[PDB]
Design a protein around this ligand. Structure first.
Ligand SMILES: Cc1ccc(NC(=O)c2ccnc(N3CCOCC3)c2)cc1-c1ccc(C(=O)NCC2CC2)cc1
Length: 349
């Protein structure tokens, strides 16, 4: 049955939410939504509430709304953000116009950790183990993150980690331009649109994150796309014939061949003092040819994680139907599908 809703304005935005959510306080805003911290009096949890901005104003926006709702309703894993609640003030499809998503409040991220704390080898093990455990689950459903970086990893006081996506706007060209953390974690094949990419892009990003936890410094802090490519190839070596053939962009292929050939560096001399097992795992993640990178499931069994690995407690996902991705539909059609998913939501136990 329908809860009672109350109204308030916070930063020239109307919020209409069930009474159970108290003490709304703005924590972020962007082209695709606005977020408030709140207290859920029904569960006793600190929560985040996201109000989608203009969810049905174009086909593009309407498909994106449906996409996020489908993804959050599916994800049920300890190291991955889940959906606590979803609501609308609308009493019918006819008046349906706003969509609110509720999750655990994710109050500290990994950027805060690396910036403000001393991490031991054991901390690195636990944190990277959790990211790989979550990635095994997400990848098992053929979901690719594509934007893993420290700011998308939430870490509580007990060092327990969840993967999310805080982005409240679009990755435009301008956004990826210059000396920016928005690009430092991206696999080269997407940075430079070399070929059709796949889930292995996320493993490149984990390699970058793990190196920064070990040294305290960004692995590839490029001043632009080309400077960053040079930093990468200096470390892992210029590509060979086999990889070159796989770069389907004739243009990208011709540029990379203009560069003086360089060998792969000695990672023990780059990561001075690091656990040899950590050096070995980084060599297996930071491979230019995405075909040859270690997978998340493979990495969980690597000797580096012997202290944490439990093959009976690394679950996979239920089948995830994303046939909708291929479908062209009108706005009112995407809006109706979204409504059906709002109406059918069942809270976690
Ligand atoms: C409330 C909410 C609702 C939905 C989403 N969406 C996602 O996290 C999301 C959206 C799309 N894909 C994923 N993935 C992709 C695959 O990997 C798993 C996560 C995750 C995020 C949030 C959210 C949750 C918490 C916070 C938050 O705590 N903000 C505080 C501010 C200091 C930072 C902000 C936003």
């Amino acid at each position: 049955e329908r809860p009672t809703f109350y109204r308030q304005e916070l930063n020239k935005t109307i919020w209409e939410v069930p009474e159970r959510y108290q003490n709304l306080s703005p924590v972020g805003s962007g082209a695709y939504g606005s977020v408030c911290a709140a207290f859920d009096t029904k569960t006793g949890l600190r929560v985040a509430v996201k109000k989608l901005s203009r969810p049905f104003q174009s086909i593009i926006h309407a498909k994106r709304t449906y996409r996020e709702l489908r993804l959050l309703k599916h994800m049920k894993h300890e190291n991955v953000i889940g959906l606590l609640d979803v609501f609308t003030p609308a009493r019918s499809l006819e008046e349906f116009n706003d969509v609110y998503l509720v999750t655990h409040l994710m109050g500290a991220d990994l950027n805060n950790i690396v910036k403000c704390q001393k991490l031991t080898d054991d901390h690195v093990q636990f944190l990277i183990y959790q990211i790989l455990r979550g990635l095994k689950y997400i990848h098992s459903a053929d979901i690719i993150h594509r934007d893993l970086k420290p700011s998308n990893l939430a870490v509580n006081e007990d060092c327990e980690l969840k993967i999310l996506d805080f982005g409240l706007a679009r990755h435009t060209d301008d956004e990826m331009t210059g000396y920016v953390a928005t690009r430092w974690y991206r696999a080269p094949e997407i940075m430079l649109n070399w070929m059709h990419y796949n889930q292995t892009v996320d493993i490149w990003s984990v390699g970058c994150i793990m190196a920064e936890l070990l040294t305290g410094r960004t692995l590839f802090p490029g001043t632009d796309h080309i400077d960053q490519l040079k930093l990468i190839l200096r470390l892992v070596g210029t590509p060979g014939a086999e990889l070159l053939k796989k770069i389907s962009s004739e243009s990208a292929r011709n540029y990379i061949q203009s560069l003086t050939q360089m060998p792969k560096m000695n990672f023990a001399n780059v990561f001075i003092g690091a656990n040899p097992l950590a050096v070995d795992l980084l060599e297996k993640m930071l491979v230019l040819d995405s075909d040859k990178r270690i997978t998340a499931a493979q990495a969980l069994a690597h000797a580096y994680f012997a202290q944490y690995h439990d093959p009976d407690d690394e679950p996979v996902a239920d089948p995830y139907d994303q046939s909708f991705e291929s479908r062209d539909l009108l706005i009112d059609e995407w809006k109706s599908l979204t409504y059906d998913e709002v109406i059918s939501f069942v809270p976690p136990p």
